Amino acid sequence: AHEASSLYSEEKAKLLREMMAKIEDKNEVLDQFMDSMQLVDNLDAYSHIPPQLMEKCAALSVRPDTVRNLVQSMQVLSGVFTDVEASLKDIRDLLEEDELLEQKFQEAVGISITSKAELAEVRREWAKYMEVHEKASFTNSELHRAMNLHVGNLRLLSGPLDQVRAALPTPALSPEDKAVLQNLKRILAKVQEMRDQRVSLEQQLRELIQKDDITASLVTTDHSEMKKLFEEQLKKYDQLKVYLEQNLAAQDRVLCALTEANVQYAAVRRVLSDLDQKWNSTLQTLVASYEAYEDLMKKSQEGRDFYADLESKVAALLERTQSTCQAREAARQQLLDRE
């Protein structure tokens, strides 16, 4: 009696173990093909502006014409650069003309230590501002090349949002390629439903066996009726195994369809991959142009402050220069006259 119920639990455990084997095999095959093919419909996302880029566009509009004012400010900085260079050139011309006249004067006859020493300080101070100016020349030049490099995107990011979205590349798929996408998406849907019903059918079979072990064991008790009762339960198990076997057999036709669709998808796959590469490429130049905009605001301010301080010094040195050179010439006028 106790051995008949034990022989039936072994028969139930065996058929359940054969079931779990056929499922693991079919899943192993199925998983290898999915992993090997690597396979979606988020094509509308290309038509959207990423939220992080919209926050940057809105930042260029909280202050009206910030890109225009940055461009103008760069032109002002470029203006005071050439002004400094020209005043430094004026001081040079005065020192060169004075040194020429002094050589001619010392030849025509056989001076003043005070003006000579002031003229030497002007020369020293001039070369100081020449070294600082030429040092900041490469910096000023690179600042303007960077401005020119990014101003077109900064104008784009400042304009209306629809032109920003128009700068991004969109998919241009023919009706044939959409069909290849739809067919591929339809088969993948069938694969997932096959996976779901497989998990479901196995659970039902496991629960049918579990409920039979709660019933004809944990509460009730039989006698010689174990022969017919085991046939009743076994009929229920076999009907579910029929559905499960249909599910397993169906996998072979589905894999053939999926691998065939994957061959048609190969041209579309590369087109869409190049579109994603291009989309993130243009997006990153817009991000980089916004990053350069912050750095340009900072360095444009540093440059205008530097060259304003430097223009003031060079303008003041030009005053000392023309005063010293004029006085030194008046001295040569007086001396060479009384000769």
């Binding site: 600042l143 750095d295 360095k299 530097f306 301080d309």
Partner: peptide, 10 residues
């Protein structure tokens, strides 16, 4: 690149 552009000190 342009972040490391420094103007001289006076």
């Amino acid at each position: 690149n342009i972040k490391s552009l420094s103007f001289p000190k006076l």
